[PDB]
Design an enzyme around this catalytic site. Structure first.
Site, PDB file in Angstrom:
ATOM      1  N   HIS A  43       0.815  -1.218   0.000  1.00 21.00           N
ATOM      2  CA  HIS A  43       0.000   0.000   0.000  1.00 21.00           C
ATOM      3  C   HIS A  43       0.862   1.289   0.000  1.00 21.00           C
ATOM      4  CE1 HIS A  43      -0.376   0.903   4.625  1.00 21.00           C
ATOM      5  NE2 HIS A  43       0.395   1.788   4.042  1.00 21.00           N
ATOM      6  N   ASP A  99      -0.193  -7.373   2.455  1.00 19.57           N
ATOM      7  CA  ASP A  99       0.411  -6.054   2.243  1.00 19.57           C
ATOM      8  C   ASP A  99       1.930  -6.199   2.105  1.00 19.57           C
ATOM      9  OD1 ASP A  99       0.338  -3.260   2.005  1.00 19.57           O
ATOM     10  OD2 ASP A  99       0.092  -2.867   4.194  1.00 19.57           O
ATOM     11  N   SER A 198       5.064   3.204   7.695  1.00 20.03           N
ATOM     12  CA  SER A 198       4.590   2.076   6.869  1.00 20.03           C
ATOM     13  C   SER A 198       5.713   1.522   5.985  1.00 20.03           C
ATOM     14  CB  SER A 198       3.447   2.526   5.962  1.00 20.03           C
ATOM     15  OG  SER A 198       2.479   1.493   5.861  1.00 20.03           O
TER      16      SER A 198
END
Lengths: 247, 19, 29
Positions: A43, A99, A198
């Site tokens: 993502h 992910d 992230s």
């Protein structure tokens, strides 16, 4: 990272910064797993409901950094991606399931004191360390809350939380390719990953060979360091066959 | 659903961050 | 020679919190 500390020099030599060519800007964290490959959250490269879909060229990979801002003249190294591989069954539609993403750096990444790969777990290593209560370590140049963004790499150690507690902390559907971490309400302490962290590694040191292993990838949360909430990470060992495969 | 967002129960959507 | 830090494991130096790390797997105090 929330309620962390400034990293020590060379503490996380596998830590990688995903840098936006223009506007120049910090995208996400990543990790060096070989001298030509980088691991990260899918993502960070592909989120349609927010029209994010970066290509090989809108990107730049920065390795051996300490300072989030500065061009660290003779210690950091910059590279260009030769290709990106997103997990074919990445679910940005439901809850950031699987992910994960690799990045075959186009030019080698010669190592040094601040650049060294992390190990990828084996079924037995994963078996013995991925236990609720066992602490892991997350690093990133993320938000210092929900000087809001640091000047030097941040670090924090967080215990693994049991799946049931993880599931009833949110209304999102948790899958077997995820695990959550953080301290409990009462525990009497906090810390968490946050925006900008992230794709960052969640590592553990194996008490058997005294090596560092990447157990997870910072994926998502619900706020940052709020009581009764936990950070969700991609389960690197469950996605390992996919990794060997594209390599 | 990134780290910086919130809960999905009744409201089935969300907005992107900023700053 | 993955997971071995040139500035910490390779010289036998411990970082200031890998100690609060190793103690979780066995449970301190």
């Amino acid at each position: 990272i929330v309620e962390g500390s400034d990293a020590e020099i060379g503490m996380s030599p596998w830590q990688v910064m995903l840098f936006r060519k223009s506007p120049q800007e910090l995208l996400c964290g990543a990790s060096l797993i070989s001298d030509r490959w980088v691991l990260t959250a899918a993502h960070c490269l592909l989120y349609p409901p927010w029209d994010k879909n970066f290509t090989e060229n809108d990107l730049l990979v920065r390795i051996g950094k300490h300072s989030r801002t500065r061009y660290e003249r003779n210690i950091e190294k910059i590279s260009m991606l030769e290709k990106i591989y997103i997990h074919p069954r990445y679910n940005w539609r439901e809850n950031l399931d699987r992910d994960i993403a690799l990045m075959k750096l186009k030019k080698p990444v010669a190592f040094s004191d601040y650049i060294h790969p992390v190990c990828l777990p084996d079924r037995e290593t994963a078996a013995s360390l991925l236990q609720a209560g066992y602490k892991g370590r997350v690093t990133g140049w993320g938000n210092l809350k929900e000087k809001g963004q640091p000047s030097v790499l941040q670090v924090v150690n967080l215990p693994i939380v049991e799946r049931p507690v993880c599931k009833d902390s949110t209304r999102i559907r948790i899958t077997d390719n995820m695990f959550c971490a953080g301290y409990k309400p009462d525990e009497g302490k906090r810390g968490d990953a946050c925006e900008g962290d992230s794709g960052g590694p969640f590592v553990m040191k194996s008490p058997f060979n005294n090596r560092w292993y990447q157990m997870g990838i910072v994926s998502w949360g619900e706020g940052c360091d709020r009581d009764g909430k936990y950070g969700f990470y991609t389960h690197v060992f469950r996605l390992k066959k996919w990794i060997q495969k594209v390599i | 659903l990134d780290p910086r967002s919130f809960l999905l129960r009744n409201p089935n959507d969300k907005y992107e961050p900023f700053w | 020679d993955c997971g071995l830090r040139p500035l910490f494991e390779k010289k036998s130096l411990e970082d200031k919190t890998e100690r609060e790390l190793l103690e979780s797997y066995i449970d301190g105090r």
